[PDB]
């Protein structure tokens, strides 16, 4: 176990949300390979050319106690905001709900996420 | 035991010149505690290519943050740092904006692991 005086944050795990294939879509996505039963926070980041066709995406976890929503929007009024604080399950997984409303969706570029883990205790 | 607080948000002070290097102190933090600051965005693009890059002046801090609001959107990076004994941390901002009439600030979110005396 890591003493609080040696606490560090690992923030180098990044990934992509699978893009939708319809203009309005609700779906889920699993993230996998996490330390089992650890506490994490997932935050949005962006390095992404705007589609300029109003690609709105909201992510949440329907577990009570996974707290927060993440919002993405790429057209003029840029959103890359929110967070979700969650605990990975006993096999190192978590699931998220995505709700997308895109005004165009030919071959959309994924929105992007970063997972942060405090390395302290046995987390 | 371990929970995160991620609701502390703030603004980076905007530049007064087209090309600028300046510092900003974030204050009010728990003295000596360890944090990670990430960029976020909730902001109308200027469309005038407002580029901002941030690094931390504190001893042993690590990372860089980048912002860019025009076509190729950047809201990226992170800095992991320790607040000083006063509850402050100093950052260096490098800005290169193609226009700069009353610019909207770029935005940050500070994450703290609430564990032990952190």
Numbering used by the authors:
A (entry chain B): 4 to 126
B (entry chain A): 9 to 126
Give excerpts from the publication.
A major factor that limits the expansion of shrimp cultures is, however, infectious diseases from viruses, such as P. vannamei nodavirus (PvNV) and M. rosenbergii nodavirus (MrNV), which have inflicted heavy economic losses. The Nodaviridae genome comprises two single-stranded positive-sense RNA that encode the capsid protein for viral capsid assembly, the RNA polymerase for RNA replication, and the B2 protein for host RNA interference suppressor. While the shell domains (S-domains) of PvNV and MrNV contain conserved sequences of 62% identity, the protrusion domains (P-domains) and N-arms show low sequence identities of only 17% and 43%, respectively. In this work, we have determined the cryo-EM structures of T = 3 and T = 1 PvNV-LPs at atomic resolution, the crystal structures of the P-domains of PvNV and MrNV (PvNVPd and MrNVPd), and the crystal structure of the S-domain of PvNV (ΔN-ARM-PvNVSd) in the T = 1 subviral particle (SVP).
As for the MrNvPd, three crystal forms (P3221, C2221, and P4332) were determined. The overall conformations and dimer interfaces in three crystal structures of MrNVPd are similar with a RMSD < 0.3 Å. Second, the structure of MrNVPd (P4332) reveals an additional metal-binding site involved coordinating with both oxygen atoms from the side-chain carboxyl groups of two Glu300 residues. The side chains of the two Glu300 residues on turn β3/β4 of the MrNVPd dimer alter the conformation upon coordinating the Cd2+ ions. The distances for the Cd2+-ligand oxygens from the two Glu300 residues are ~2.4 Å. Finally, the initial difference map shows one outstanding electron density peak near residues Cys309 and Thr343, which is interpreted as one Cd2+ ion. This Cd2+ ion is coordinated to the sulfur atoms from the side chain of Cys309 residue, one sulfate molecule from the crystallization buffer, and a backbone carbonyl oxygen atom from the main chain carboxyl groups from residues Thr343.
